[PDB]
Amino acid sequence: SSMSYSWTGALITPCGPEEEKLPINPLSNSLLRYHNKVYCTTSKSASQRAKKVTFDRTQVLDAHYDSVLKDIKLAASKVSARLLTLQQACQLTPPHSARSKYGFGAKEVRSLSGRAVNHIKSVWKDLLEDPQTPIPTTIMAKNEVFCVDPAKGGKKPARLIVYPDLGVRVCEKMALYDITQKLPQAVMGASYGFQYSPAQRVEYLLKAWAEKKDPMGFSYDTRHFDSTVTERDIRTEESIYQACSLPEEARTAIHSLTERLYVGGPMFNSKGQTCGYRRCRASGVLTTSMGNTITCYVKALAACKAAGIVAPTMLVCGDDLIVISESQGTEEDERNLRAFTEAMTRYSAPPGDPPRPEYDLELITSCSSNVSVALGPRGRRRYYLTRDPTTPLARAAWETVRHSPINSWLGNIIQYAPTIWVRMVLMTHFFSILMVQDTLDQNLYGVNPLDLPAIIERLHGLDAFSMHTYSHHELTRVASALRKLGAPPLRVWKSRARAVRASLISRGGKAAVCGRYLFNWAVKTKLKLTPLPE
RNA sequence: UAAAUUU
RNA sequence: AAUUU
């Protein structure tokens, strides 16, 4: 029946001017050569994104869906949740959050300026007194960096972000925040993926894998999941929120926000014109993440039941899931995934790329990452998390007047410290750069480079400094991504690392600790590394 | 724009 | 601040 969007025809305009690369990239031109492949998505491409996300939805539910939906509500009723004092909600606003149309921004909100507090009270009044008038939203194209990919189109068109004014964002938090903190875990138990750390997510996947007699795994993602959300899904989302114990005042707000904001509304471009109308998920709302995850979980568990997946063990993070189950032979397994995918499609959550059963944990990707294995110091298998380095390397080379990528290097160094690509490429380059700038003591996004060894031990285990014998997949992929971006091959990084290492040792202090721990892989005479006080 | 995780 | 979705 219903259509995800409708368009006035007005353009999707830019928040401000969009930054462009320069003829020299001083920080990254030693990292990689092919800067022509590094691009940032712009509003210029917004029109194309709109076409791909505008389409007719038809949903057909069934006993399996209904049964799951029932069970989820008997779980939701164990949750009691409170309102948030207008003030408490203001304090959860992020520092640089986009300012309101009504002459105040986040400085004012977080500091509880009177004008801001007053407007907000007024907006929350209106939610209580009017449960129908659509709330207007702004639509913008997100600016994100990527490496080109001819196999999949050349250059991706920009994601569309749709969000209400700042006043409404706070009110949302008042009504819903406590719920967002309690509901998912109460509904999905151990299947709620955002609860876990990267290490726990690995322990969990392995425990699941291990406890089957004959494991079969797969992953599923939905194509433009936000468009696939039906008006009805969003209302079913409401009724799940209401299953909790709630202040009467919340209920009225939840319902008002549902009917006015969440199921749809008009859209205005940054220059002010009417741009279109919306009958699906808005990316910009508080319930976007919770809602996606619950809704995906409902459909997925229903589909599991439609398709006969035996003994499923799930993991859901938004529209991304992994099911680990007992194989029924490859013949039946292939049949059931086909079924799973039909069921999901009938529920209006069709796949980007249809899924496939797999029988090796390394071959299951989800959230653009996967589990792999290498050998540890004493020769035991050590399982860990990694990904295609293509994007991180591309983002590593995004240098603009306004933007430096050094923060991104560090972010990826920490998150992925056991990965061969971090250890040989990013680390070498990061430390090489700061040594020459002579800025190791300096703080990057409130982290001290010289704390890395400690930081990494806390997070990844001392094994992170001594791992070796990486998988064929991981070696092939790293090699292939450095070749793709015109970076030196690993052998060259081996050389650079030795040099960096020696230089770091020269300086003594914490610098030499970094030199010895982070770069021990690079030497012939590997020094025995023990735990670190810090 | 929203959230989660990491610091 | 980073990353993910």
Ligand SMILES: C[C@@]1(F)[C@H](O)[C@@H](COP(=O)(O)OP(=O)(O)O)O[C@H]1c1cnc2c(N)ncnn12
């Ligand atoms: C907008 C989304 F709902 C998106 O559809 C959903 C699934 O992620 P993905 O599978 O990567 O993207 P599509 O399925 O939409 O192609 O997660 C939310 C999402 C992703 N990114 C952002 C963001 N930057 N802000 C807010 N929400 N959001």
Ligand SMILES: [Cl-]
């Ligand atoms: Cl070991």
Ligand SMILES: [Mn+2]
């Ligand atoms: Mn998706």
Ligand SMILES: [Mn+2]
């Ligand atoms: Mn209601």
Ligand SMILES: [Mn+2]
């Ligand atoms: Mn996804």
